[PDB]
């Protein structure tokens, strides 16, 4: 039957909430790093 | 030499602002809108914002406007009401920006935030022709945002040295300690000097004002030679010394008796200059001679191509 | 040097106003309406507003009008009835705006609000030809809105310094304190001086009037050199000093005996100028020489390209 | 300097009036009706109003009329029967308006209300050719509406200063207080002076008449330089001072020995002018020199491009 429970192959959330990022450091520079990986 | 002339404060720093704008007037010589679609699109956006909606399908072939990029230097401790100078450079195919007017371009930092608003009249120079696609506006930009700073907080201030040097840092620290109380300054590296200052913006400002005008002697930096190779320029430091050697270069020979001219050892810059001149050659030949000499020794200095 | 000449008040600030308008007359030389659709559309809008409705499908090929952008500087404390000068710049392909008339253009701020109304006659200059696509109208704009201000409220006023400097701020604070009561002023940073003033618009105005004309000596700012490279201009500060070095540049040689001219150490601007002149070169060669020298040291100043 | 010459009253204000009209005569040289449809349509409207109905489908190719825009300055306290001057500017492709006649054009304000009626004869000037597409009619417009005003009501009148200045406002307030009773005037900001006057139109008029002709000395305004860059004009204030510096500009050299001319420090305008003249250059070169100097310091004034 088509009503039997099934798990789609693309499991998990299909969405990611963006991170606001790091608060600026008052070092007097407009440029702000982003935690290099 | 004053401390201000060879050192910069940790908190004092400039920033770069960039923006897009349009220049009107120009007596023609503007962008060719056929080959510069962004000019017409931006003009239409401005007209729509002002209240005029031009139909999408239209000719719009104008020659009195030019799309430009405006660059500004956000100064340290910038205040909201202050004004700064801006540089306007043509973007498309505009012939000139002689008497153009920059119209309300927002100047933003690297964070995409509007930090200034630029508007005014461009000034450009009126066989060495002047650059007619780039001009400067004095006080053309008014600041809008203020960068937060830590100045006045803490008890340590870092003086940063241009062209770092251990001897230079030691001299600066010694001068600061002699002028101020004992242990007022301490060198952290070849380029940084940490100075202890009392808490408070006013006290820190007074201390920095006293320190900046202090007179410090400059010790011999280094034996350094600069060769441009693009502008045909050669510059030698006062510390450059020449070791005895023989050099042979194409078409160069002893005045008199032939090639392989001798170069006498020279300890001071005057002797080095006199020996090199005796080894008569144009600057272009001198660059090659210096490169070969440094490769073979006989040149007690470091040479760099700029 | 007066405080007004090197400092600006926190509350006093200018704003930029922009607007769109039309110029009539011109004895021809106006916009080509075929290539400038917005001109005809705006003229039709004006006619319809006045009471004339031109059919949509019509030729409307006129040459006595030109679409222009008008820019104005909203002055601080602008009053409703006051007038300001405006700059009118051609927008389309108009040849000239010699004797044109600007017709009732609304000047708006960055908030899209009408802050002035501009109308009047354009004045343009009558081989260095003048700019005939850009003119100025004196008192051509009448203000309509007044910007609210906090002036007279609070007890602290911030004086902002152009070309911030710790020594300059300290000097300003010392002068203010000496002239006025003890502790009247305090430097907050290299660019801001907070002055305590009594509450009240009249009292604040009197205090500012007294402070502005105060005479303050200007300490040595910095050893700075400006190279245009676009107008062929080189300017040196009075604090510029030259270190001993040897420079070789293309086609330049000792007067007399060849290249590699010696540059004597110079402490003052007069000595620097005399040494550089002895190193005979045109300004274009001088720019390259200065760049190479600064790269190699031998130049106790910071040089910037403008 | 009189108060009237540097101050304006709050209630006294001018307004702008615009209108559309037709000019007849012209000995030809009128609008090309084929390319100016609105001219023929307006002429047909006028004929129909007068009692003549031209068929819609007709040639109507006339050359003795031109569509024009008429602009007028509604003066303060305008009376119904008074007359004002108007400016008539061609709208279409008319060649000239030499001896034309403006016919009963309604002059309206920004509210779309008819404030005047303009009719009369155009006067235009009869290698610097005059503007033949724009003329002036003296007393050509008769007012129709009167703007309500609050003058005579209340007890406070605001004097508004052109080119606001704290020192200027303080001087005006001091002069008003000295001439009139104690506390008669009080400065509210750098541009506004509130004066207490007795209730009543006659009393307020007498007070304003007494105040306007009052003599007030003008303090040093500011060190300001104006560069046109469009008309090739440079103007310097009497407060401009020049700092010692060296300037090198293309093709400029010491009279005598080469480039890099020295500029002596000058405190007064005469010294500044003499030094700049010694640094011999045309106004166009002077503009670039001044820009570079101001960028590098050495110029104790603010320079603006107009």
**Secondary-structure class of chain B:** alpha+beta
Please count the helical segments of chain B.
6
Strand order of the largest sheet of chain B: 2-3-4-7-6-5
Query: Quick one: overall form of chain B?
Result: flat
The geometry of chain A reads as rod-shaped
Give the amount of beta strand of chain B, in percent.
25-35%
Radius of gyration of chain A: 21 Å
Order of helical and strand elements of chain B: HEEHEEEEEEHEEHEEEEEHHEE
CA-CA gap between termini of chain A: 48 Å
**Percentage beta strand of chain A:** under 5%
Count of distinct strands of chain B: 17
Structural class of chain A: little secondary structure
Question: Hey, which two chains have the biggest interface?
Answer: B-C, 99 and 99 residues
Could you give a short account of the major beta sheet of chain A? Answer: none
Total of DSSP H or I helical runs spanning 4+ residues of chain A: 0
Quaternary state of the chains:
part of a larger assembly
Largest sheet of chain B: 6 strands, antiparallel, barrel
Pfam families (chains B, C, D): FlgI
Subcellular location (chains B, C, D): Periplasm; Bacterial flagellum basal body
Subunit structure (chains B, C, D): The basal body constitutes a major portion of the flagellar organelle and consists of four rings (L,P,S, and M) mounted on a central rod.
Function (chains B, C, D): Assembles around the rod to form the L-ring and probably protects the motor/basal body from shearing forces during rotation.
């Amino acid at each position: 039957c088509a009503w039997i429970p099934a798990k789609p192959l693309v499991q998990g959330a299909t969405t990611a909430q963006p991170i606001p990022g790091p608060v600026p450091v008052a070092n007097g520079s407009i440029f702000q790093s982003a935690q290099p990986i | 030499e004053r401390i201000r002339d060879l050192t910069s404060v940790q908190g004092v720093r400039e920033n770069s602002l960039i923006g897009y704008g349009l220049v009107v007037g120009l007596d023609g010589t503007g962008d060719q809108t056929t080959q510069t679609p962004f000019t017409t699109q931006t003009l239409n956006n401005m007209l729509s914002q002002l209240g005029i909606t031009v139909p999408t399908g239209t000719n719009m072939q104008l020659k009195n406007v030019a799309a430009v990029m405006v660059t500004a230097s956000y100064p340290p401790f910038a205040r909201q009401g202050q004004t700064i100078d801006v540089v306007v450079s043509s973007m498309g195919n505009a012939k000139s920006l002689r008497g153009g007017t920059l119209l309300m371009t927002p100047l933003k930092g690297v964070d995409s935030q509007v930090y200034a608003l630029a508007q005014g009249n461009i000034l450009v120079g009126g066989v060495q022709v002047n650059q007619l696609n780039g001009g400067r506006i004095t006080n053309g930009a008014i600041i809008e945002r203020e960068l937060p700073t830590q100045f006045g907080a803490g008890n340590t201030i870092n003086l940063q040295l241009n062209d770092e040097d251990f001897t230079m840092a030691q001299q600066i620290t010694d001068a600061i300690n002699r002028a101020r109380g004992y242990g007022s300054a301490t060198a952290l590296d070849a380029r940084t000097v940490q100075v202890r200052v009392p808490s408070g913006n006013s006290s820190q400002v007074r201390f920095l004002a006293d320190i900046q005008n202090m007179e410090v002697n400059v010790t011999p930096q280094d034996a350094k030679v600069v060769i441009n190779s693009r502008t045909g320029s050669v510059v030698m430091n006062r510390e450059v010394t020449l070791d005895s050697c023989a050099v042979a270069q194409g078409n160069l020979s002893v005045t008199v008796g032939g090639s392989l001219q001798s170069v006498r050892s020279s300890a001071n810059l005057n002797s080095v200059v006199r020996a090199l001149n005796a080894l008569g050659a144009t600057p272009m030949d001198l660059m090659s001679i210096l490169q070969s000499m440094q490769s073979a020794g006989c040149l007690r200095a470091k040479l760099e191509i700029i």
